[PDB]
Design a protein around this ligand. Structure first.
Ligand SMILES: [Mg+2]
Ligand SMILES: [Mg+2]
Ligand SMILES: [Mg+2]
Ligand SMILES: [Mg+2]
Ligand SMILES: [Mg+2]
Ligand SMILES: [Mg+2]
Ligand SMILES: [Mg+2]
Ligand SMILES: [Mg+2]
Ligand SMILES: [Mg+2]
Ligand SMILES: [Mg+2]
Ligand SMILES: [Mg+2]
Ligand SMILES: [Mg+2]
Ligand SMILES: [Mg+2]
Ligand SMILES: [Mg+2]
Ligand SMILES: [Mg+2]
Ligand SMILES: [Mg+2]
Ligand SMILES: [Mg+2]
Ligand SMILES: [Mg+2]
Ligand SMILES: [Mg+2]
Ligand SMILES: [Mg+2]
Ligand SMILES: [Mg+2]
Ligand SMILES: [Mg+2]
Ligand SMILES: [Mg+2]
Ligand SMILES: [Mg+2]
Ligand SMILES: [Mg+2]
Ligand SMILES: [Mg+2]
Ligand SMILES: [Mg+2]
Ligand SMILES: [Mg+2]
Ligand SMILES: [Mg+2]
Ligand SMILES: [Mg+2]
Ligand SMILES: [Mg+2]
Ligand SMILES: [Mg+2]
Ligand SMILES: [Mg+2]
Ligand SMILES: [Mg+2]
Ligand SMILES: [Mg+2]
Ligand SMILES: [Mg+2]
Ligand SMILES: [Mg+2]
Ligand SMILES: [Mg+2]
Ligand SMILES: [Mg+2]
Ligand SMILES: [Mg+2]
Ligand SMILES: [Mg+2]
Ligand SMILES: [Mg+2]
Ligand SMILES: [Mg+2]
Ligand SMILES: [Mg+2]
Ligand SMILES: [Mg+2]
Ligand SMILES: [Mg+2]
Ligand SMILES: [Mg+2]
Ligand SMILES: [Mg+2]
Ligand SMILES: [Mg+2]
Ligand SMILES: [Mg+2]
Ligand SMILES: [Mg+2]
Ligand SMILES: [Mg+2]
Ligand SMILES: [Mg+2]
Ligand SMILES: [Mg+2]
Ligand SMILES: [Mg+2]
Ligand SMILES: [Mg+2]
Ligand SMILES: [Mg+2]
Ligand SMILES: [Mg+2]
Ligand SMILES: [Mg+2]
Ligand SMILES: [Mg+2]
Ligand SMILES: [Mg+2]
Ligand SMILES: [Mg+2]
Ligand SMILES: [Mg+2]
Ligand SMILES: [Mg+2]
Ligand SMILES: [Mg+2]
Ligand SMILES: [Mg+2]
Ligand SMILES: [Mg+2]
Ligand SMILES: [Mg+2]
Ligand SMILES: [Mg+2]
Ligand SMILES: [Mg+2]
Ligand SMILES: [Mg+2]
Ligand SMILES: [Mg+2]
Ligand SMILES: [Mg+2]
Ligand SMILES: [Mg+2]
Ligand SMILES: [Mg+2]
Ligand SMILES: [Mg+2]
Ligand SMILES: [Mg+2]
Ligand SMILES: [Mg+2]
Ligand SMILES: [Mg+2]
Ligand SMILES: [Mg+2]
Ligand SMILES: [Mg+2]
Ligand SMILES: [Mg+2]
Ligand SMILES: [Mg+2]
Ligand SMILES: [Mg+2]
Ligand SMILES: [Mg+2]
Ligand SMILES: [Mg+2]
Ligand SMILES: [Mg+2]
Ligand SMILES: [Mg+2]
Ligand SMILES: [Mg+2]
Ligand SMILES: [Mg+2]
Ligand SMILES: [Mg+2]
Ligand SMILES: [Mg+2]
Ligand SMILES: [Mg+2]
Ligand SMILES: [Mg+2]
Ligand SMILES: [Mg+2]
Ligand SMILES: [Mg+2]
Ligand SMILES: [Mg+2]
Ligand SMILES: [Mg+2]
Ligand SMILES: [Mg+2]
Ligand SMILES: [Mg+2]
Ligand SMILES: [Mg+2]
Ligand SMILES: [Mg+2]
Ligand SMILES: [Mg+2]
Ligand SMILES: [Mg+2]
Ligand SMILES: [Mg+2]
Ligand SMILES: [Mg+2]
Ligand SMILES: [Mg+2]
Ligand SMILES: [Mg+2]
Ligand SMILES: [Mg+2]
Ligand SMILES: [Mg+2]
Ligand SMILES: [Mg+2]
Ligand SMILES: [Mg+2]
Ligand SMILES: [Mg+2]
Ligand SMILES: [Mg+2]
Ligand SMILES: [Mg+2]
Ligand SMILES: [Mg+2]
Ligand SMILES: [Mg+2]
Ligand SMILES: [Mg+2]
Ligand SMILES: [Mg+2]
Ligand SMILES: [Mg+2]
Ligand SMILES: [Mg+2]
Ligand SMILES: [Mg+2]
Ligand SMILES: [Mg+2]
Ligand SMILES: [Mg+2]
Ligand SMILES: [Mg+2]
Ligand SMILES: [Mg+2]
Ligand SMILES: [Mg+2]
Ligand SMILES: [Mg+2]
Ligand SMILES: [Mg+2]
Ligand SMILES: [Mg+2]
Ligand SMILES: [Mg+2]
Ligand SMILES: [Mg+2]
Ligand SMILES: [Mg+2]
Ligand SMILES: [Mg+2]
Ligand SMILES: [Mg+2]
Ligand SMILES: [Mg+2]
Ligand SMILES: [Mg+2]
Ligand SMILES: [Mg+2]
Ligand SMILES: [Mg+2]
Ligand SMILES: [Mg+2]
Ligand SMILES: [Mg+2]
Ligand SMILES: [Mg+2]
Ligand SMILES: [Mg+2]
Ligand SMILES: [Mg+2]
Ligand SMILES: [Mg+2]
Ligand SMILES: [Mg+2]
Ligand SMILES: [Mg+2]
Ligand SMILES: [Mg+2]
Ligand SMILES: [Mg+2]
Ligand SMILES: [Mg+2]
Ligand SMILES: [Mg+2]
Ligand SMILES: [Mg+2]
Ligand SMILES: [Mg+2]
Ligand SMILES: [Mg+2]
Ligand SMILES: [Mg+2]
Ligand SMILES: [Mg+2]
Ligand SMILES: [Mg+2]
Ligand SMILES: [Mg+2]
Ligand SMILES: [Mg+2]
Ligand SMILES: [Mg+2]
Ligand SMILES: [Mg+2]
Ligand SMILES: [Mg+2]
Ligand SMILES: [Mg+2]
Ligand SMILES: [Mg+2]
Ligand SMILES: [Mg+2]
Ligand SMILES: [Mg+2]
Ligand SMILES: [Mg+2]
Ligand SMILES: [Mg+2]
Ligand SMILES: [Mg+2]
Ligand SMILES: [Mg+2]
Ligand SMILES: [Mg+2]
Ligand SMILES: [Mg+2]
Ligand SMILES: [Mg+2]
Ligand SMILES: [Mg+2]
Ligand SMILES: [Mg+2]
Ligand SMILES: [Mg+2]
Ligand SMILES: [Mg+2]
Ligand SMILES: [Mg+2]
Ligand SMILES: [Mg+2]
Ligand SMILES: [Mg+2]
Ligand SMILES: [Mg+2]
Ligand SMILES: [Mg+2]
Ligand SMILES: [Mg+2]
Ligand SMILES: [Mg+2]
Ligand SMILES: [Mg+2]
Ligand SMILES: [Mg+2]
Ligand SMILES: [Mg+2]
Ligand SMILES: [Mg+2]
Ligand SMILES: [Mg+2]
Ligand SMILES: [Mg+2]
Ligand SMILES: [Mg+2]
Ligand SMILES: [Mg+2]
Ligand SMILES: [Mg+2]
Ligand SMILES: [Mg+2]
Ligand SMILES: [Mg+2]
Ligand SMILES: [Mg+2]
Lengths: 253, 60
RNA sequence: GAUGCCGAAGGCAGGGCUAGUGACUGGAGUGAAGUCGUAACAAGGUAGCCGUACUGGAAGGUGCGGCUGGAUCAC
RNA sequence: ACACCAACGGCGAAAGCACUCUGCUGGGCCGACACUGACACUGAGAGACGAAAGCUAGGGGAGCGAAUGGGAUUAGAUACCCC
RNA sequence: CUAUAACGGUCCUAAGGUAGCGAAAUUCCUUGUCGGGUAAGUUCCGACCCGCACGAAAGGCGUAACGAUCUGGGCACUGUC
RNA sequence: AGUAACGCAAACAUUGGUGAGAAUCCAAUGCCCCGAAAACCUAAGGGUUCCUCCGCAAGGUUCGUCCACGGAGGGUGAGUCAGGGCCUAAGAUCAGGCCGAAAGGCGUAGUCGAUGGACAACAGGUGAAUAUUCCUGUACUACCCCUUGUUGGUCCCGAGGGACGGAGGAGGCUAGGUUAGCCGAAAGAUGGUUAUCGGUUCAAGGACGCAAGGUGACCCUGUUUUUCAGGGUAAGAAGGGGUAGAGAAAAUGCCUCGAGCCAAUGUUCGAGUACCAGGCGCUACGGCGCUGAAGUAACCGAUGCCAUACUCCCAGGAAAAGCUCGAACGACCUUCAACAAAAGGGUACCUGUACCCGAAACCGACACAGGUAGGUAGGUAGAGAAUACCUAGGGGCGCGAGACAACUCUCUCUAAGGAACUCGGCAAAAUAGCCCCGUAACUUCGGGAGAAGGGGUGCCCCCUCGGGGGUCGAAGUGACCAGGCCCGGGCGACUGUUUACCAAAAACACAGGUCUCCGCAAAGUCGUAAGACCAUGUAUGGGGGCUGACGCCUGCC
RNA sequence: GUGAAACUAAGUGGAGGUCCGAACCGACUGAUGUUGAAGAAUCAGCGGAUGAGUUGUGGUUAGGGGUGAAAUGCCACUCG
RNA sequence: AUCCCGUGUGAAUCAGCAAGGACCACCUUGCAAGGCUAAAUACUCCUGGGUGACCGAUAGCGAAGUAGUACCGUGAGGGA
């Protein structure tokens, strides 16, 4: 399950460093900072190298995502990491291509997938690399396919069209019990580089739209508000006309 | 544990001239205005914080 | 004579068991006659009963399952 | 959830179990002497199973439907009836 | 029998405070009344409810551990007296 | 107003000396203080304060013959120590490029940037002021020089490596220390005594070497599995070789060879006519010349070394160069040209280097009861880097002398009482270590708990490896050090955080809960824009709002 | 212990925003100080002390801003 | 009106076109959508002459001597 190897060439130290500071150096994404140093594992999301026979040597921990990751070999000797599929065991064999068996960890275009399958690691764009359903226990069913377009039900529940020529991988993503963890203490959050958050109602009127009333503030604001002055609850922020809209059918519920 | 007045501590001259030093005033436009301004008043020393890269005053 | 060991009351301390008592409060029983209703016994006027959950001033009501110690009709 | 089959029928220790199929498996009964030769019956404590409702955690949610709301009925209706 | 009101009538609203708690960090009148602790108690603990003006995620009610917390009492101890 | 004060309550004293002048300057003898510093050294900083001679106007909280003050004259020596001639992190600048009234903003290669990687030196001596720098010994890097051996080497490129956490304990060791043994000296006016006092040191480096250490697969039998003993298995460890695929090396797959390997430390050289107790002689009585005995052993024992060695954990633990290896592609250079080796000789870039640095020299306007990273870590008691008393080493606080009123402050003690004090037991006093017995309600079953409460404790002999006997004292963890506890309630679950300099809490945070947004050219945030963050992430994820562990719940409009 | 499992002494193990306590970080109470020895200290006590720890060096964020476990706190004795 | 600009439409060549303070007629005046040009005018970090009902060391320049010095400030800056 978890045993540390030496470092394969896939593990580097190069990275953005200030978390949540942009160019201007300002904090943009709040609450980050602190927390253990990490190294970047170079995942292979594309899986674009076709028609060679890959073998899972080990299963390893990754700090960066909550899934697991597998070191896989080839006969050619190239080594990649892949996301760990759910139920896959060391010694297993995987392959990507067009005409391929359908089993755990194999990767194929959506032209060749039998309907009803459970998929992860889904490209929305040809050769761009896999994007959708990359987290622990995440999975998406391929419900129907018609014309040049295939239909999925994403782990958010949202049903959406994508291209039939985009690669994807069978099997759900491993390490399913990760959200069953209970951190138990403050320190355990801080280890993840997630700093403490101050409730709006608490800060002074200059600092935030629910500002100090005398004793304890109900929010008098006629509405719950962002730090920046927008309605906090149920105001849809999706760009009205965004290009994706023809593709999206039912919205997550 | 140290008094408020202690704002100026012992700090490596290297670090200071990497802040107020000469070669830094030369970078920005506003700095060049600085140096024209000081030359106008005609001060004996243009950059107070400065430092030899190597020499008797050198910080390693 | 002195002294060591063991030594009863006496002292302190926490325990176990029981006696009495206590502002207030929960129900039980008997009071012809009071109030509110009419749940049960006839198909008791929505069939009844058992377990159980929710709710109702109160007897209760409904749900889910079970049984006939159910009438009417089927024989 | 499984019409007809369904029956005063079958199996199960009881609870229960029924569209169809296949696989793993528990018993029951019957006919033979093939064999052991009383190894039996019950059971304090103890164990396992145990309708429905209920609860914890995660899913799922069409119909039905406690609670709840409206409409009536009624002296009243926190019920029967309806949505 | 004095009392109180499970019960009914009426008014008005979008609807009229349920569980639980309650003289409270909330109680004005007020040192409420009762019980306890003290020789004596405006504080303290338990309870009553007549909640000026508790109340259910501006959470309600419990709660072991914890606190240079706030608040009452007791033994030891002392120039605090 | 000739008033307050003269900057801690470590403490001075006397005899000489210099001098016009001495509580204050020098020396001697005592006494006292620090000793996880008030000691020695190094980073930063300061900038000549360092040393010598002269001076005593001002400075110095008094004095002053003195000085961190003033005047003159000196002083810092490196192939190896620290930086640069090497490499990259955060970060910075950024050719071209994108955007922008201008100034400029973003950003790629590049280039900067140590607090990190890489890389070679130690002992003794001299010494008014420097010493891993100068001198004498042995060392070591990098170049050049010759001999020999090969013919292609060099860069670009492909690779291996460099290269990495926390916690825990067990080893194996040294550094230090203590006691013996050896050697030398000793009479220190006392009742006794030599039981006393000193010495017993040596580095980097080079050769060797490694078990009772640590690691080296499985199976059977026993030793508690372990340290072990017999057998067997056939790569089964460091470590090597071969092959195969587009395939040099590498990675990867198959085949094969190897029972040892690891590294602190240790032995030997270095290393003795070094160093040194004393001994002899001179005294400008400051210091100096001369000769030198022994130089081993045992037991304590690290927080240092092996060591990124193990075992466990989740929060999963830098990059690049030097270094090792290597075909094709490109560029350049080519014969006494280049590269490869073991000897031998030779050769040796800048800058820092004084002094102070738990400070009268830095930072606090002061010669200010303060702040300031790192290194080294002796004795007796002690669990200890606490405390107490000491060594090495350094100091006696830059005003004294008296007298001994009130009063204020820092402290000791107080008859009888014991919270009567007071807003309030505020402040004091009390308790305390170790071993033994004992230990409640309540509970989330972890706790509560060192609950409470009790006993024992010194010094001698005797027994077993704790028990008995004696004996002092008013008192035995006799000093220092070192918990007061119990019963209730409110608030907040908890450790945490906070108003630098009047508030540390019941405020904030929190694990947990729940609502809403967001399908990746995401939502959100920052920018005029380019773009940046979010994220090299992808709904078990990212925003935002309220509440705040766990338990029971969360009603109506 | 049963056939599987549960349950319970034992040893080993060495978890912990565990405990006591120096260094170190703080700043709870008192006393002194108030033309201070000091523009926030000394004295005696006091809290944390393997962590949401402390600190060094070198960096980042800048005023229609920044940062904030949120006090209008902090941004060179200056901060609605 | 004249003049000059963003977005959009968009003419006429001298029998034309523009101006004459909405606009139209008539007359008068002029020839946009290409450039360049001296003098009279503004000023004093200064240079050379001249004058002063200007100062005379608290004045006159901040500065009659180390003056943008000493000193203060991290720095911009203050400044005898
Ligand atoms: Mg790595
Ligand atoms: Mg590597
Ligand atoms: Mg920047
Ligand atoms: Mg939260
Ligand atoms: Mg919060
Ligand atoms: Mg506030
Ligand atoms: Mg902000
Ligand atoms: Mg506002
Ligand atoms: Mg408000
Ligand atoms: Mg209020
Ligand atoms: Mg200066
Ligand atoms: Mg007795
Ligand atoms: Mg008793
Ligand atoms: Mg009653
Ligand atoms: Mg009754
Ligand atoms: Mg009666
Ligand atoms: Mg009835
Ligand atoms: Mg009935
Ligand atoms: Mg009946
Ligand atoms: Mg009902
Ligand atoms: Mg109903
Ligand atoms: Mg029924
Ligand atoms: Mg039967
Ligand atoms: Mg059925
Ligand atoms: Mg069968
Ligand atoms: Mg027989
Ligand atoms: Mg029985
Ligand atoms: Mg059961
Ligand atoms: Mg059920
Ligand atoms: Mg319920
Ligand atoms: Mg459920
Ligand atoms: Mg429904
Ligand atoms: Mg219905
Ligand atoms: Mg109704
Ligand atoms: Mg509704
Ligand atoms: Mg009605
Ligand atoms: Mg009456
Ligand atoms: Mg009514
Ligand atoms: Mg009524
Ligand atoms: Mg009515
Ligand atoms: Mg109405
Ligand atoms: Mg309504
Ligand atoms: Mg209504
Ligand atoms: Mg009520
Ligand atoms: Mg009720
Ligand atoms: Mg009550
Ligand atoms: Mg009262
Ligand atoms: Mg309350
Ligand atoms: Mg009230
Ligand atoms: Mg009152
Ligand atoms: Mg009484
Ligand atoms: Mg009373
Ligand atoms: Mg009182
Ligand atoms: Mg009360
Ligand atoms: Mg109210
Ligand atoms: Mg409230
Ligand atoms: Mg509310
Ligand atoms: Mg609350
Ligand atoms: Mg409590
Ligand atoms: Mg605390
Ligand atoms: Mg006692
Ligand atoms: Mg007194
Ligand atoms: Mg006078
Ligand atoms: Mg006077
Ligand atoms: Mg006087
Ligand atoms: Mg005086
Ligand atoms: Mg004074
Ligand atoms: Mg003094
Ligand atoms: Mg001492
Ligand atoms: Mg000193
Ligand atoms: Mg020194
Ligand atoms: Mg230095
Ligand atoms: Mg000088
Ligand atoms: Mg001197
Ligand atoms: Mg003088
Ligand atoms: Mg003087
Ligand atoms: Mg003289
Ligand atoms: Mg001098
Ligand atoms: Mg960089
Ligand atoms: Mg730039
Ligand atoms: Mg450019
Ligand atoms: Mg770059
Ligand atoms: Mg450099
Ligand atoms: Mg360095
Ligand atoms: Mg070096
Ligand atoms: Mg170098
Ligand atoms: Mg010296
Ligand atoms: Mg030397
Ligand atoms: Mg030398
Ligand atoms: Mg030598
Ligand atoms: Mg060499
Ligand atoms: Mg390379
Ligand atoms: Mg490192
Ligand atoms: Mg050890
Ligand atoms: Mg030794
Ligand atoms: Mg001895
Ligand atoms: Mg002897
Ligand atoms: Mg004698
Ligand atoms: Mg001796
Ligand atoms: Mg050696
Ligand atoms: Mg050699
Ligand atoms: Mg061995
Ligand atoms: Mg090869
Ligand atoms: Mg080959
Ligand atoms: Mg190989
Ligand atoms: Mg030993
Ligand atoms: Mg330690
Ligand atoms: Mg250390
Ligand atoms: Mg490790
Ligand atoms: Mg070539
Ligand atoms: Mg070679
Ligand atoms: Mg030197
Ligand atoms: Mg030196
Ligand atoms: Mg002094
Ligand atoms: Mg001082
Ligand atoms: Mg000091
Ligand atoms: Mg010691
Ligand atoms: Mg002790
Ligand atoms: Mg000892
Ligand atoms: Mg000490
Ligand atoms: Mg001494
Ligand atoms: Mg005196
Ligand atoms: Mg006196
Ligand atoms: Mg007394
Ligand atoms: Mg007495
Ligand atoms: Mg007494
Ligand atoms: Mg008493
Ligand atoms: Mg009292
Ligand atoms: Mg009193
Ligand atoms: Mg009194
Ligand atoms: Mg006290
Ligand atoms: Mg005391
Ligand atoms: Mg006493
Ligand atoms: Mg004791
Ligand atoms: Mg004592
Ligand atoms: Mg016991
Ligand atoms: Mg209990
Ligand atoms: Mg316990
Ligand atoms: Mg308690
Ligand atoms: Mg105990
Ligand atoms: Mg005790
Ligand atoms: Mg207790
Ligand atoms: Mg005792
Ligand atoms: Mg005792
Ligand atoms: Mg005794
Ligand atoms: Mg005897
Ligand atoms: Mg005895
Ligand atoms: Mg005695
Ligand atoms: Mg005794
Ligand atoms: Mg104490
Ligand atoms: Mg203690
Ligand atoms: Mg309490
Ligand atoms: Mg209560
Ligand atoms: Mg109260
Ligand atoms: Mg708290
Ligand atoms: Mg604690
Ligand atoms: Mg802080
Ligand atoms: Mg404060
Ligand atoms: Mg603070
Ligand atoms: Mg506090
Ligand atoms: Mg706060
Ligand atoms: Mg976006
Ligand atoms: Mg979510
Ligand atoms: Mg969130
Ligand atoms: Mg709250
Ligand atoms: Mg709650
Ligand atoms: Mg509970
Ligand atoms: Mg142990
Ligand atoms: Mg702790
Ligand atoms: Mg203790
Ligand atoms: Mg305070
Ligand atoms: Mg203190
Ligand atoms: Mg402490
Ligand atoms: Mg304490
Ligand atoms: Mg404590
Ligand atoms: Mg502690
Ligand atoms: Mg820990
Ligand atoms: Mg750090
Ligand atoms: Mg700090
Ligand atoms: Mg803060
Ligand atoms: Mg300033
Ligand atoms: Mg400030
Ligand atoms: Mg303020
Ligand atoms: Mg015109
Ligand atoms: Mg005009
Ligand atoms: Mg016009
Ligand atoms: Mg314009
Ligand atoms: Mg035209
Ligand atoms: Mg004209
Ligand atoms: Mg024209
Ligand atoms: Mg025009
Ligand atoms: Mg023109
Ligand atoms: Mg022009
Ligand atoms: Mg004058
Ligand atoms: Mg003047
Ligand atoms: Mg004059």
């Amino acid at each position: 399950q978890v045993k540390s190897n030496p470092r394969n060439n896939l593990i580097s130290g190069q990275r953005r460093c200030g978390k949540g500071r942009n160019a201007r150096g300002i904090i943009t994404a709040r609450h980050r900072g602190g927390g253990h140093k990490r190294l970047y594992r170079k995942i292979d999301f594309r899986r674009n190298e076709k028609d060679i026979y890959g073998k899972i040597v080990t299963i390893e921990y990754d700090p960066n995502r909550n899934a697991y990751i597998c070191l896989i070999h080839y006969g050619d000797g190239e080594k990649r990491y892949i996301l760990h599929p759910r139920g896959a065991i060391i010694g297993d064999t995987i392959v990507s291509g067009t005409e391929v068996p359908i089993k755990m960890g194999n990767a194929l275009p959506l032209t060749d997938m039998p309907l009803g399958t459970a998929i992860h690691n889904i490209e929305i764009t040809l050769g761009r690399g896999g994007q959708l359903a990359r987290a622990a226990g995440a999975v998406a069913k391929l419900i129907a396919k018609e014309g040049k377009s295939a239909t999925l039900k994403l782990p958010s529940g949202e049903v959406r069209l994508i291209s039939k020529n985009c690669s994807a991988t069978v099997g759900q993503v491993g390490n399913v019990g990760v959200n069953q963890k209970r951190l138990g203490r403050a320190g355990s959050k801080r280890w993840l580089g997630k700093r403490p958050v101050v409730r709006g109602v608490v800060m002074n009127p200059v600092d935030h739209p629910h500002g100090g009333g005398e004793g304890r503030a109900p929010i008098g604001r006629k509405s719950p508000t962002t730090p920046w002055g927008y309605p906090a609850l149920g105001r849809r922020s999706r760009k009205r006309n965004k290009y994706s809209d023809n593709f999206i059918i039912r919205r997550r519920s | 544990k140290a008094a408020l007045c202690l704002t100026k501590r012992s700090r490596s001259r290297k670090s200071l001239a990497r802040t107020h030093g000469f070669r830094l005033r030369m970078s920005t436009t506003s700095g060049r205005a600085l140096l024209k301004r000081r030359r106008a008043k005609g001060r004996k020393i243009l950059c107070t914080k400065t430092n030899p890269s190597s020499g008797k005053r050198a910080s390693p």
